[PDB]
Amino acid sequence: DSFVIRGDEVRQIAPGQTGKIADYNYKLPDDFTGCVIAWNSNNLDSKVGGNYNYLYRLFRKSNLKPFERDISTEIYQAGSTPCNGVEGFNCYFPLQSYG
Amino acid sequence: DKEWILQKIYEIMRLLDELXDAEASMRVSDLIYEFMKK
Amino acid sequence: DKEWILQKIYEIMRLLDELXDAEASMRVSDLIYEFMKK
């Protein structure tokens, strides 16, 4: 498995290690004794002015299941408010804009 | 609970990545994670 | 916990002032004065 993770959050990849930037869109179940390597990708994969290329739903109703990975256009909810893009107090479209 | 605060700090994230200093938005993001877990 | 939250948004104010925009700074100061009462 390969994915984007920022620098000072790299260490968060651990069994039973939840989080915000490391959990809401990825999770490893317990019992994997292996290796992960992180490194700078800016010598080729970066650009000045905001690298408008990455995204992950910054809100979700819970964590992820063992190695769960499910796409979702669904908004986050506190109440039951039907919102399809309009920013209310609980509409909360989880689009986190990595530029 | 603090839905006012949640809406306001989400607005802050919006404006903050609408700034250029894209980094404190993500900090506030983990802060909201902290609110939700608490 | 509660003081961690108040001081992380303390730092929110601090950092945003370290960025520089009178408007958003006023807004988040309103935010902290609102939260500490709530």
UniProtKB/Swiss-Prot annotation, chain A:
Role noted for this protein: Attaches the virion to the cell membrane by interacting with host receptor, initiating the infection. The major receptor is host ACE2. When S2/S2' has been cleaved, binding to the receptor triggers direct fusion at the cell membrane. When S2/S2' has not been cleaved, binding to the receptor results in internalization of the virus by endocytosis using host TFRC and GRM2 and leading to fusion of the virion membrane with the host endosomal membrane. Alternatively, may use NRP1/NRP2 and integrin as entry receptors.
* Subunit architecture: Binds to host ACE2. RBD also interacts with the N-linked glycan on 'Asn-90' of ACE2. Cleavage of S generates a polybasic C-terminal sequence on S1 that binds to host Neuropilin-1 (NRP1) and Neuropilin-2 (NRP2) receptors. Interacts with host integrin alpha-5/beta-1 (ITGA5:ITGB1) and with ACE2 in complex with integrin alpha-5/beta-1 (ITGA5:ITGB1). May interact via cytoplasmic c-terminus with M protein. May interact (via N-terminus) with host bilirubin and biliverdin, thereby preventing antibody binding to the SARS-CoV-2 spike NTD via an allosteric mechanism.
> What would changing Q96N do, according to UniProt?
Reduced host ACE2-binding affinity in vitro
List the disulfide bonds in this chain: C83-C91
Superkingdom, taxonomy of origin: Viruses
Per the UniProt entry, the effect of S80N is: In strain: 20A.EU2, Iota/B.1.526, Omicron/BA.1, Omicron/BA.2, Omicron/BA.2.12.1, Omicron/BA.2.75, Omicron/BA.4, Omicron/BA.5, Omicron/BQ.1.1, Omicron/XBB.1.5, Omicron/EG.5.1
Where do the record's region annotations for Immunodominant HLA epitope recognized by the CD8+ lie? 51-59
In UniProt terms, what is the effect of altering Q96R? In strain: Omicron/BA.1, Omicron/BA.2, Omicron/BA.2.12.1
**What name has this protein been given in UniProt?**
Spike protein S1
Q: What are the boundaries of the region Integrin-binding motif? A: 6-8
User: What happens on changing K20T?
Assistant: In strain: Gamma/P.1
Which residue stretches belong to region Disordered? 58-93
Q: What is the effect of changing V86A?
A: Increased resistance to neutralizing antibodies
Reported effect, A78V:
Increased resistance to neutralizing antibodies
Annotated source species = Severe acute respiratory syndrome coronavirus 2 (2019-nCoV)
Parent-protein residues present: 398 to 496 of 1273
- Changing D8N: what effect? In strain: Omicron/BA.2, Omicron/BA.2.12.1, Omicron/BA.2.75, Omicron/BA.4, Omicron/BA.5, Omicron/BQ.1.1, Omicron/XBB.1.5, Omicron/EG.5.1; complete loss of interaction with host integrins
